[PDB]
Chain A
Amino acid sequence: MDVFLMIRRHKTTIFTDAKESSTVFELKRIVEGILKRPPDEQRLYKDDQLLDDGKTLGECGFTSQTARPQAPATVGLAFRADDTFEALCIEPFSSPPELPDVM
C-alpha cells in the first residue's frame, strides 16, 4: 500500500510516495537522490520522534489511510553540518488572511 508524504526541512518540502512496507533508510535514499546528501547525514522525524533506520513506515505510523494523496503525512528532516546534527526546524507555511465579509 502506498503512503503519501511531505518531507520537510526549513523552507524545503518534498512530495513523494512510498510503500507502507518500505524502510526509513529507503526513504533517506529517496531524499539522497533529490537533495544530494547521504543517509548518514540525515535524520528523519515523526513530530519530535527520531525514526530508526530499519523500521518500516507502517511501524512508524505512516499508513495508507492517514498518509493520503490529498492530505499527506509530514516527515521531518534534519542534516548533519560536518560534525553534529542541526536541530529539527520546519518553517511554517504562510497564514491565510481574514475571510472577506461576504464569506
Chain B
Amino acid sequence: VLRSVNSREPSQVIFCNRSPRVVLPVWLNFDGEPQPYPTLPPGTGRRIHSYRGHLWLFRDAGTHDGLLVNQTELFVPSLNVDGQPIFANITLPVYTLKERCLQVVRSLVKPENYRRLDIVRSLYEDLEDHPNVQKDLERLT
C-alpha cells in the first residue's frame, strides 16, 4: 500500500538536514520495499533528482530513530513551479522524554547487556524494541 507511484515526471528536490544527526534518506520503491540512499552529515544539503508521487522518509543513519520532513513523516515530491526545486526540511521531532531516555541508554549499553540493568521487564522490552523502518511502515499502514 505505501509505495511510490511510477509517474516518470521529474521533480528536483533539496534534502536539507537541519538536524544534529547523520541522516539516512529512504525511498519506498514501486513494491513498497525501503531502499536506502547515501547519508547526509548534520547541517548539510544535497540537490537530488526524484519524481512526482515518489515517497521518502528519513532516519538517523546510526540508530534508525525517526525524523520529520516538512513537519511530517513522509515526503512526496510535487510539481516544480518555475524550475524551483522543492525543499525537504529534515528536523528532529520533539521526542517524548521516555523515547529520548531510551535513545541515550541504547547508545551507552550494548544489546547483550540490556538485561543486566536494574529496571522493570517492560523497559527491557522497550530497549530491545529498536526503531526500525519496517515496523513504522506497518504502523503507517
The residue on A at minimum CB distance from B113 is A102
For the complex formed, measure the closest distance between the CB of B16 and the CB atoms of chain A, giving whole angstroms. 22
Interface of A is mostly: loop
The residue on B at minimum CB distance from A103 is B108
User: Which A residues are in CB contact (< 8 Å) with B108?
Assistant: 103
For the complex formed, measure the closest distance between the CB of A101 and the CB atoms of chain B, giving whole angstroms. 8
Asked whether any CB of chain A lies closer than 8 Å to the CB of B8, the reply is no
CA distance A100 to B116 in the complex (A): 9
Asked whether any CB of chain A lies closer than 8 Å to the CB of B48, the reply is no
Number of interface residues, chain A, beta carbon within 8 A: 4
Asked whether any CB of chain A lies closer than 8 Å to the CB of B109, the reply is yes
Which residues of A86-103 are within 8 A (CB) of B? 100-103
User: Which B residues are in CB contact (< 8 Å) with A102?
Assistant: 109-110, 113, 116-117
User: Which A residues are in CB contact (< 8 Å) with B117?
Assistant: 100, 102
User: Which B residues are in CB contact (< 8 Å) with A101?
Assistant: 116
The residue on B at minimum CB distance from A99 is B108
For the complex formed, measure the closest distance between the CB of B99 and the CB atoms of chain A, giving whole angstroms. 16
The residue on A at minimum CB distance from B114 is A102
CA distance A102 to B115 in the complex (A): 10
Taking A100-B118, A103-B108 as given, write out 9 further A-B residue pairs in contact, using a Cβ cutoff of 8 Å, ordered by the A residue number.
A100-B116, A100-B117, A101-B116, A102-B109, A102-B110, A102-B113, A102-B116, A102-B117, A103-B109
